[PDB]
Design a protein around this ligand. Structure first.
Ligand SMILES: [Mg+2]
Lengths: 115, 69, 69, 79, 125, 217, 107
């Protein structure tokens, strides 16, 4: 459950998410009518003095049975047009992104591993 | 540098040979793309670097051309 | 055992008496058309009912594992 | 068979190939040195040569041809 | 019916410059087929995406549900996720940047995926 | 005689008939799908069909860290680390889309709950995905793995050193000073283990169930 | 204006201000921050230069880093404290005489 001011991990190969500038990116906004962000929910990110959109692909909060609970809050950086900023994702991504309402096919194309 | 430079030639021959029968994929593009892959990487490499590059190409040959149809 | 399986929660604690009657919602206005109109009489026994009656969507136990084919 | 047919056809298929510039497309045109073609390039020349005539041979001497007349001669004795 | 053969033929008819079809292994659970198609301009991408969607609804799919068109906000990459097939359409420049074909052809030997590395974090001193 | 935990009824005011109805459905599923014997700490491989995909199943391998639930709602959680990312999935035993449950390695651990493995070093949670099952011997007891894991820096998901958790599988000496172990014991509640009204005897209940399960077979 | 001290560095970011200071200081050729702080050949990456100065001042923090397996507190060189001190020496004037408006508005 990502909220405002939560520290999140950029699970991507994009330059902005690299370990330099150790300060973790923090959530500024959750694009939901509730402010709670779950898997598949977009958020606005404070990263390296920039404001960038990100998509939640994993979090530590328990979900419904038969679904993966991760050890970190993961996100992928998204361009304003909606194209992913990074070109590869190596960490496992839950398969539930496929069905839920939204535009997630672009991200799934980038990720080899699904869990 | 490679496991054997003849194996590099053998790998390229098979890839073109396998691509000859592709129908759904754009045969012309596949031939051009393979040329770019071979030229960009293989021109300059070391023993370890070339071995890894050749190994990935070998997987492509034995994996039904990486699922290409 | 005369057990009804009802979706969701019912007011009250376990072992408490409840009142159950056909739904008064407009969508299910006339459902008694295909139900025992006064009531179900075991005395008539036109056809002895199975021990368990199921809804079509319900996946019965002892069925094969659900594969979304 | 048309031995000269192979020469012109080899000359023609090589002429069709666009990457090589037919600055000197003689019957004795070398590939490693005269045309500056690498091991990668010649194989594709084999495919173009093979495609026209129908292959039926391995790379045993296709690599060794190194010139149109040699392959023409090699295509000359295989048919 | 709407099948791989029909889809490629429809793409061919409307002059898709570059077409690649990858049969994803069943072990990978994403989809049966993966298709990538290049297009000259954003106008061309929209037309073919709309054309295929119109044909898909026309071509049976009575039991199968409808498909959303994704990426209309973007000007260079459109992807439609049919049940058994996913088609990603993009302009030339976008294609080389992402290089989707290498990722799905070389499952785990992709060059960019290889460049990425794992880390551990002990104290500085 | 290994009675699966789900069959044991929890104490309360519920009618025993509610359990008979649930058991009949549970046993019917066990006929279609065989649910193997396993304990917390054993490595399991579970095959499940994905609704998102079409007729395409998925396999997950991990160590079982918790068993909970009674009746048809029984669940178990198993953990693993994949490309350096820890993942846990909670599985419903009787979910119809579980194709197979395979006990890759049957073993028991010092504690019946292994949620502290989240705070232990990654090695203790990483398991090879393609590992083949190890042989098991019927004429034996279940092997009790007595490994005591090493914990990472003190900030933990829970205060495992505290007496309530009753953790016996952590190397507390390496991670905690003798004073900290002393300071923890202020939470000890020693009287808990000696008050006889907090103990639920299931020996007779477990006994009667065993023949009933066998009788149906 | 942030470099001049007009803006309270905490609503602009010490790190971002530090990067601009290094960016301007290198362009103007005033490599006087490589002698106050031993930086050898000098650099253009703020993270690298901030690493060295933090070492020179023997400052360390316990910082929560977010990794795949969870959150761990790791002792780290103090980049923020380095940025604050690096700006201070610039403000005192020991890092050289700077005219910011030289480049954009030379007129
Ligand atoms: Mg907590």
């Amino acid at each position: 459950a990502v909220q405002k001011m939560t520290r999140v991990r950029v699970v991507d190969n994009s330059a902005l998410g690299s370990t330099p500038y150790h300060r973790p990116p923090r959530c500024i906004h959750v694009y939901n009518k509730s402010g709670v962000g779950k898997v598949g929910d977009q958020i606005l990110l404070a990263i390296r003095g920039q404001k960038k959109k990100a998509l939640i692909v994993g979090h530590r909060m328990p979900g419904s049975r038969m679904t993966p609970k991760f050890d970190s809050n993961n996100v992928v950086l998204i361009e304003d047009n909606g194209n992913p900023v990074g070109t590869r994702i190596k960490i496992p991504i839950p398969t539930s992104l496929r069905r839920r309402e939204g535009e997630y096919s672009k991200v799934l194309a980038i990720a080899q591993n699904f869990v | 540098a490679p496991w054997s430079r003849e194996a590099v030639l053998c790998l390229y021959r098979a890839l073109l040979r396998q691509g000859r029968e592709l129908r759904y994929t754009d045969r012309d593009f596949y031939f051009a793309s393979i040329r770019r892959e071979f030229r960009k990487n293989q021109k300059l490499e070391n023993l370890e670097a070339r071995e890894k590059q050749l190994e990935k190409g070998l997987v492509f040959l034995h994996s039904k051309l990486g699922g290409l149809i | 055992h005369n057990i009804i399986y009802v979706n969701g929660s019912v007011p009250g604690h376990k072992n408490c008496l409840v009142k159950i009657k056909d739904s008064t919602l407009p969508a299910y206005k006339d459902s008694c058309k295909n139900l025992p109109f006064p009531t179900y009489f075991p005395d008539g026994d036109e056809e002895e009912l199975p021990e368990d009656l199921f809804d079509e969507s319900v996946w019965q136990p002892s069925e094969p594992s659900i594969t979304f084919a | 068979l048309t031995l000269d047919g192979i020469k012109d056809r080899v000359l023609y298929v090589l002429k069709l190939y666009d990457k090589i510039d037919p600055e000197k497309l003689s019957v004795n045109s070398h590939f490693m040195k005269d045309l500056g073609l690498d091991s990668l390039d010649q194989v594709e020349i084999i495919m173009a040569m093979e495609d026209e005539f129908g292959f039926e041979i391995p790379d045993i001497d296709a690599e060794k041809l190194m010139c149109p007349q040699e392959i023409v001669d090699y295509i000359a004795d295989k048919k | 019916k709407f099948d791989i053969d029909m889809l490629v033929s429809l793409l061919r008819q409307e002059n898709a410059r570059d077409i690649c079809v990858i049969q994803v292994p069943p072990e990978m659970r994403y989809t049966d087929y993966f298709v990538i198609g290049s297009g000259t301009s954003t106008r061309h991408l929209h037309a073919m995406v709309h054309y295929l969607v119109k044909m898909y609804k026309h071509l049976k799919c009575r039991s199968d549900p409808y498909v959303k068109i994704e990426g209309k906000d973007a000007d260079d990459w459109l992807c439609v996720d049919f049940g058994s097939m996913v088609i990603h359409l993009m302009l030339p420049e976008t294609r080389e940047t992402y290089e989707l074909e290498k990722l799905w052809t070389l499952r785990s030997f992709d060059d960019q995926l290889a460049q990425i590395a794992a880390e551990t974090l002990p104290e500085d001193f | 005689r290994f009675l699966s935990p789900e069959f044991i009824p929890p104490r309360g005011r519920t009618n025993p008939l509610k359990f008979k109805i649930e058991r009949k459905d549970m046993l019917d599923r066990r006929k279609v799908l065989p649910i193997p014997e396993f304990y917390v700490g054993s490595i399991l491989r579970v095959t499940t069909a994905d609704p998102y995909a079409s007729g395409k199943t998925s396999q997950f391998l991990g160590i079982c860290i918790k068993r909970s639930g009674n009746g048809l709602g029984a669940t178990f959680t198993l953990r693993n680390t994949i490309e350096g990312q820890g993942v846990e999935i909670c599985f419903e035993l009787y979910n119809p889309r579980i194709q197979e449950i395979q006990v890759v390695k049957l073993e028991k651990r010092l504690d019946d709950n292994l949620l502290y493995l989240r705070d232990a070093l990654p090695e203790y949670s990483t398991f090879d995905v393609n590992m083949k099952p190890v042989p098991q011997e019927a004429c034996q007891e279940v092997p009790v793995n007595k490994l005591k894991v090493k914990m990472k820096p003190k900030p933990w998901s829970k205060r495992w050193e505290r007496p309530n958790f009753n953790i016996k599988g952590i190397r507390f000496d390496l991670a905690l000073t003798e004073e900290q172990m002393k300071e923890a014991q202020k939470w000890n509640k020693p009287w808990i283990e000696f008050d006889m009204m907090r103990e639920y005897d299931t020996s007779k209940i477990e006994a009667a169930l065993w023949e009933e399960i066998e009788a149906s077979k | 204006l942030a470099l001049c001290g007009t803006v309270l560095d905490h609503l602009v970011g010490e790190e971002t201000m530090a990067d601009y200071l290094l960016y301007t200081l290198n362009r103007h050729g005033l490599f006087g921050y490589v002698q106050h702080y031993a930086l050898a050949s000098a650099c253009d990456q703020i993270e690298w230069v901030l690493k060295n100065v933090a070492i020179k001042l023997r400052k360390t923090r316990k910082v929560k880093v977010l990794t795949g397996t969870g959150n761990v507190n790791v002792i780290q060189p103090d980049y923020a404290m380095a940025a604050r001190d690096f700006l201070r020496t610039f403000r005192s004037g020991l890092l050289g005489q700077v005219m910011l408006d030289r480049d954009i508005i030379p007129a």
